[PDB]
Amino acid sequence: APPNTLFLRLEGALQSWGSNEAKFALRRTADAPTKSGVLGLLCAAMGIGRAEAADSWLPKLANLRMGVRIDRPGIRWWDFHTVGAGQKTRAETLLSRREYLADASFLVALQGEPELVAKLSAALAKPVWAIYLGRKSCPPSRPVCEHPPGFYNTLEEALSAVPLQKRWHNEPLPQILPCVMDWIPGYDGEHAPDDAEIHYDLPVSFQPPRHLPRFVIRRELVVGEDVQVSRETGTSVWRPKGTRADYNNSEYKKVRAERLVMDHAACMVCKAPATTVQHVNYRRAGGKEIPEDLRALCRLCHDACTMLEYGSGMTTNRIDPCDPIWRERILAKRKEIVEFRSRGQRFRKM
């Protein structure tokens, strides 16, 4: 089946779709992408300049029906923007305020002719020029060409075949999804209904910018009956590995014996029958260590090594007994253990 509709995902950290009430200094977003807004994004996708687009490309593109579904309705944030005149000639500074929509997501569906939709979707996979969201200081956070086309039906049906993506586990959700749709003719309701508002977003020209009124209707959707909630992919919260060493799984129990044969049953520093193994590099533990990470030791020398690294703040690189810099401290601790230990206490505890 030939494609009928086209899907656009508009979501970023900041975005702003200006309205006609922005006349002198205060620039305001309306609530949602407009027809003239998205049909400058499509025009910049196929590389059509401000001239040569009004006479040819705009009338065919304006012959479309589009609807916007709103999730994360956005929080309006204002910005104090100053333009420095000078740095006519004066040292004056012009002040203005600009409005942005923070943390918003919009799904736009444009329905029309099949091959025009195919050309538009082919253009969106590699846009000719830079693509932003309303103003050039607002890049998208998700790819615009993220959902495939299809031979769907009228805009309410086209705004139901997209899942509602989430981002983390306890992400709050709205039960209602308001949607804004273009009015539809048909000669039964040939006159505009009572609940229809008027928007000035029908583009004709861009360099001497020209906009025409367009009747706009509003509807609603409910999650669970029309749109199914999806789930996030990947991992968001990042934590260091930090694998605590285990002395009970089979892999470490075989690696330890392999190391105890690699050194011929001799403690490394004092050269006595080794009964234990001490790690050096800790960033392999949990059952993935290599025999080169481990060094064989006896009870006295490993107790001295444990004493020497109790509160030293060593995370991954621990004491290496083969290092000839740690020899003196290990020998002194061994002498202290020989002088002060009591075998009776250890024999009594076990």
């Binding site: 970023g12 950290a13 900041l14 401000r50 005149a85 996979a125 590699k126 846009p127 000719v128 020029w129 830079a130 693509i131 932003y132 050039k136 200081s137 607002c138 890049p139 998208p140 956070s141 998700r142 790819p143 615009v144 060409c145 981002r167 983390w168 992919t233 990947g234 991992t235 968001s236 919260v237 990042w238 934590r239 260091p240 930090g242 995370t315």
Partner: protein
Amino acid sequence: LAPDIALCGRMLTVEAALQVAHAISTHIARPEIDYFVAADDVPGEDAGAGHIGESMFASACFYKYFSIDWEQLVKNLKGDTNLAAHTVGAFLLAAAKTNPSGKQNSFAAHNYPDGILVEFKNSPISYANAFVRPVSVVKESDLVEQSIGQLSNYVNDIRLGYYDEQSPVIGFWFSPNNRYPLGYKHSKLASRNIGNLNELVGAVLDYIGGFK
């Protein structure tokens, strides 16, 4: 034919190439206040009339995003590809070693980036969705390493989901003396992890067309 007009745009058609976006921090904003007092050099010891004021400051770890249109820049220079490459390198140096001048005579926050990633792709994107969870600091980490780790996780997820389709992506992760690698294994999360700004500029320039 000046670089300052073709790349940045008009002084005050001539469509530019830069897409400097708003720099948004990767954690909870923590505004702090300062109670300064305009002290008097002459002692006087009379007529106090307290001079308590307030000035707000903050400290944050910002994620900054930039884009450059190569075709638009080339059309702006009408064919001087060497000049275009030189301007790209100059911007790569400048945007890395330049800070805003707001209140730097009292705070002097002359810090340097802790990691720059240069990518080439067809569609545009911004990794702002990586820090949808504010970064919480733990015992064996700092804020910078955790921000870089979250960026690595998002890059891993994107390259697992959005890749192939006869369009492989290329990364050029950089860090000063490689103190902050972008993840561990996973094909190093990008191409070569290099530790010098000049090497990064050279790598990008030699990737674009084998320039100088």
